[PDB]
Amino acid sequence: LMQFTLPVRLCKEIELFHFDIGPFENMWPGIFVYMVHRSCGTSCFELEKLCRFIMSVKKNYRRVPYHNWKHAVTVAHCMYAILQNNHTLFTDLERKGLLIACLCHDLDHRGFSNSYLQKFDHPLAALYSTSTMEQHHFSQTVSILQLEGHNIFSTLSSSEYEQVLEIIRKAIIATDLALYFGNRKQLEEMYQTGSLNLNNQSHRDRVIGLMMTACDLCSVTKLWPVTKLTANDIYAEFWAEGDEMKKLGIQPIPMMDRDKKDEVPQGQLGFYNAVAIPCYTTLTQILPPTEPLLKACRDNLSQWEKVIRGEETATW
């Protein structure tokens, strides 16, 4: 066999939740295949079809500051770390589906929220009334899977193919943060009443949904220099959207107004308290080995507090 291998530092550090995939774009396909081979198996996919699939997915991500090809592979790496540290808990189809779902979860993102597409009256908003961009990301995934020589699931039965596409659809839709609040609340109530049941498919769907949020937000679980620099890319998009809202004659929300840049540290503190900490808290309760994501999130919360107190300086 031809096994994928990484340099010694990457081989060790890729197993860490806080791993950064680095600035060499040409290494990310190899990093992804390496993670598929270890988390799924060398027989899960035909290498030729998987490589062709990866390069078509890359081509359908756009040159935007944050929702780009690097984000796709970064979210996949976080899923890899969750799967490898919980390897008894997931099925063969979930291992085949979830790294692919992560790679594809923001396909053809233009750096604009569902709200902006609604206000602009974009054709996508007419086609998909809720989770507009996420329904688009899934449609783009199906289009690529149906290209000649791109059926990476060709050895699955019709019923198994339908199952894995359902895992991918639900996982991509779960990255709509509007749906996270309800999903985490349901999971919190289920865990605390001891009703949570990983044999229940509707429960598995919710746990996978929370895993997808955890992976999607994972910049907050990196080492501080990575967290701080990624925040610059996130705001580059938010502020471009705020400019476009102002062009429509609509006041943007504070996080999208570039004139409010001095309030970013307090905005981050608000986001960590309201979204990130609860997300990784609930995930650790369900999957204790994901603890390092929560620890790293708490460490970054403390860094943003230091910035607010003027002990740290967050420059753009």
Ligand X SMILES: CNCCN(C)C(=O)c1cnn(C)c1C(=O)Nc1ccn2cc(-c3ccccc3)nc2c1
Total of chain residues touching Zn ion, rule CB under 5 A: 2
Q: Is 216 in the site for Zn ion (CB under 5 A)?
A: yes
Q: Is 241 in the site for Mg ion (CB under 5 A)?
A: no
> In sequence order, what are the residues at sequence separation of 6 or more whose Cβ sits closer than 8 angstroms to the Cβ of residue 22?
10
The residue from 37, 67, 136, 150 that is catalytic is: 67
Among residues 164, 208, 234, 293, which is the contact residue for ligand X, using CB under 6 A? Answer: 234
Q: How far is the CB of 220 from ligand X (least distance, A)?
A: 5
Among residues 49, 52, 246, 260, which is the contact residue for ligand X, using CB under 6 A? Answer: 260
Q: Is 271 in the site for ligand X (CB under 6 A)?
A: yes
The token duo for 22 is 């680095």
Closer Cβ to Zn ion, 113 or 268, answer by number: 113
Site residues for Zn ion, window 88-107 (CB under 5 A)?
106
Closer Cβ to ligand X, 94 or 237, answer by number: 237
The token duo for 267 is 């905005």
Site residues for ligand X, window 169-198 (CB under 6 A)?
177
Q: How far is the CB of 204 from Zn ion (least distance, A)?
A: 21
Task: Report the C-alpha gap between 91 and 309 in whole angstroms.
Answer: 47
Among residues 94, 106, 237, 241, which is the contact residue for Mg ion, using CB under 5 A? Answer: 106
Task: Report the C-alpha gap between 52 and 152 in whole angstroms.
Answer: 9
Chosen from ligand X, Zn ion, Mg ion, none, partner binding at 76 (C-beta under 5 to 8 Å by type): none
Phi, psi (5° rounding) for residue 243?
Answer: -55, -45
Q: How many CB atoms lie within 10 A of CB 24?
A: 9
Q: Is 216 in the site for ligand X (CB under 6 A)?
A: yes
Amino acid at residue number 153: F
Give the angle 241-128-74 at the CA atoms, nearest 5°. Answer: 55
Look up 18 and say whether it is catalytic.
no
Helix/strand/coil for 55 = helix
Binding site, annotated residues: 67, 71, 105-106, 216, 268
The token duo for 37 is 């081979």
Which candidate, 170, 161, 205, places its Cα nearest to that of 187?
205
Closer Cβ to Zn ion, 18 or 37, answer by number: 18
> How many alpha carbons fall within 13 Å on the CB side of residue 176?
22
> In sequence order, what are the residues at sequence separation of 6 or more whose Cβ sits closer than 8 angstroms to the Cβ of residue 166?
none
Amino acid at residue number 213: T
Closer Cβ to Mg ion, 102 or 296, answer by number: 102
Q: Are 256 and 245 in contact (CB under 8 A)?
A: yes
Closer Cβ to ligand X, 54 or 297, answer by number: 297
Q: Are 143 and 176 in contact (CB under 8 A)?
A: no
Q: How far is the CB of 71 from ligand X (least distance, A)?
A: 9
Phi-psi sector, 62: left (phi>0), alpha (psi -120 to 50), beta: beta
Chosen from Mg ion, ligand X, Zn ion, none, partner binding at 260 (C-beta under 5 to 8 Å by type): ligand X
Cα dihedral sign for 41, 42, 47, 51?
A: positive
Q: How far is the CB of 36 from Zn ion (least distance, A)?
A: 19
Of 32-40, 48-56, 153-161, 260-268, the segment contacting ligand X by CB under 6 A is 260-268
Q: How far is the CB of 208 from ligand X (least distance, A)?
A: 16
Give catalytic residue positions.
Answer: 67
Give the interface with Mg ion as residue ranges (CB under 5 A): 106, 175
Give the interface with Zn ion as residue ranges (CB under 5 A): 106, 216
Give the interface with ligand X as residue ranges (CB under 6 A): 177, 216-217, 219-220, 231, 234, 254-255, 260, 263-264, 267, 270-271
